[PDB]
Amino acid sequence: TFKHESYYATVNELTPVGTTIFTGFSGDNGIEYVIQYNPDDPTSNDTFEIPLMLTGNIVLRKRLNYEDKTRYFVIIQANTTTTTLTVDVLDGDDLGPMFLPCVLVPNTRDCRPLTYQAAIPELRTPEELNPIIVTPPIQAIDQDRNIQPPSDRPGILYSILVGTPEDYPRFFHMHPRTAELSLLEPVNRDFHQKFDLVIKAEQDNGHPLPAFAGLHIEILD
Amino acid sequence: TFKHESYYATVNELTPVGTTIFTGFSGDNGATQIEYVIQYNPDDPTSNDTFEIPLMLTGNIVLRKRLNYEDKTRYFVIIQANTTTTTLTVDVLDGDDLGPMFLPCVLVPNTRDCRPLTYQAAIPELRTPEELNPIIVTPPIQAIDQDRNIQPPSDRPGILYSILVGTPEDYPRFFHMHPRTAELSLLEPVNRDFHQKFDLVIKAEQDNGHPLPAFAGLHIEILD
Ligand SMILES: [Ca+2]
Ligand SMILES: [Ca+2]
Ligand SMILES: [Ca+2]
Ligand SMILES: [Ca+2]
Incomplete structure (x- = not known):
């Protein structure tokens, strides 16, 4: 089970692909972390990834665009319990x-x-x-x-x-x-x-x- | 006393201000408390304006100004430890x-x-x-x-x-x-x-x- 029940990050829309954008499962604050397809926000699992399944850090996988989309609901599962990371894009x-x-x-x-x-x-x-x-x-x-x-x-x-x-x-x-x-x-x-x-x-x-x-x-x- | 005579990083020109762009002093890979600060480089005056070390004890370098591949693609950052200096060469990647x-x-x-x-x-x-x-x-x-x-x-x-x-x-x-x-x-x-x-x-x-x-x-x- 997760320490908070939901989480929050912001990301500037110019942030290059490959950048780590959330570390808040590190430090006793969150075991294998993987991202689920979210039926209610289909593109979120394409846009964000966890490359190192044991640390749960989230890395940007596709390039963002404030003009197309400003909010992502990322479902993260742990090994079982899920949580939602809300990610707001900041206009760049x-x-x-x-x-x-x-x-x-x-x-x-x-x-x-x-x-x-x-x-x-x-x-x-x-x-x-x-x-x-x-x-x-x-x-x-x-x-x-x-x-x-x-x-x-x-x-x-x-x-x-x-x-x-x-x-x-x-x-x-x-x-x-x-x-x-x-x-x-x-x-x-x-x-x-x-x-x-x-x-x-x-x-x-x-x-x-x-x-x-x-x-x-x-x-x- | 630095472990390597010089260091190297790349940074995409779109990288937002505030991003950490080099961590290579962090895992015993820098100098041997120990205090890292950026010097004015006479040969590259704008490098100390473009990069900063906000936490003097970890020596991580954070981008302070917005980059522009069209104006400048290479920075020579002088970092001092307290005492001994080293040069971090930073290449901007076109975005x-x-x-x-x-x-x-x-x-x-x-x-x-x-x-x-x-x-x-x-x-x-x-x-x-x-x-x-x-x-x-x-x-x-x-x-x-x-x-x-x-x-x-x-x-x-x-x-x-x-x-x-x-x-x-x-x-x-x-x-x-x-x-x-x-x-x-x-x-x-x-x-x-x-x-x-x-x-x-x-x-x-x-x-x-x-x-x-x-x-x-x-x-x-x-x-x-
Ligand atoms: Ca914009
Ligand atoms: Ca503008
Ligand atoms: Ca272009
Ligand atoms: Ca460019």
Whole structure:
């Protein structure tokens, strides 16, 4: 018979296969330990294993994914008595940002491509137009919705990656933190009728994992 | 007094902060209380920031910062015992934290980002799939893992190609993309009176449950 009647572990979703994720039967706290097929949670015996049947330590056998599954009920049997180990997956930083709005493409987890829009009158000063209004507003968030603790959450950096015509940096500046768009110089429609830019949103923590969107800017009368 | 002149560990780049990554001082295999602490290494300054010994008496090494195979793959960790030092060489193993990239990948100046791609094709009107297939795309559609050194090779995901979205909306009637080769097939003759051009978005993703997709444009002109 078992000392507690149920047990609990957490595992970061990035934990490599082969890592030992629970040792709590060691130290008088639990004899041959083996994992049972759990009818109520079929995939748990595929995801976790006890390689050394005498110590009862549990090793991760398949790669986890917070987006697919966050809780496992692992039935462990001893030689007879069973117990349930509940294993909660902790969300890890394996995804980058997404721009909003994100309308999912049917039968995917991918956002439908997005082209933000702006329109600038010709021959008017930065002074009269700034900030330039983008529709919908430029806005990105982490696809990782439940990183803990909150101090581990990255910020997002916005930028203009590339664009046509190639002299766009002369006319536009994007704020790296707010995505606010600034005209730097009046535009003459005799020389520029439209700009087509690619905007980037990335994480500031050394793991950019960037998302991209379009920004089309019309130049009016 | 250390038992070996130097030591060696590997660590997967995805290993969470807080994980214990080397235990090889623990079973009488280190020095002969006995206190293990990490020194600043002048020749590798960031190693003492990346690794720590929280329990000074057991000498086990715990990862303190998140690793990145793309920035750095080898650490020289100086460990001192109280007194005598030794070097632990730590190799980072490439982990699956990046998805594919379409080729060619020409880097955008001052970024690590591929310049976006629009693949091109041009189909004559009124000609059969039989006479045109496979449709020639320029450059050829093709993606590879951004993770360049995954080991062993049996751990490498396969790549799945698809047409994500497109305009005009009846493109699936005329075009099929092979999920594994990216080969593009015309399914039906095109009449230029009804269809002049197609603008598609192509996706390349991993088949291992961690898609991490890349996207590219495919423009198709319909000629005389
Ligand atoms: Ca995640
Ligand atoms: Ca993230
Ligand atoms: Ca990698
Ligand atoms: Ca990969």
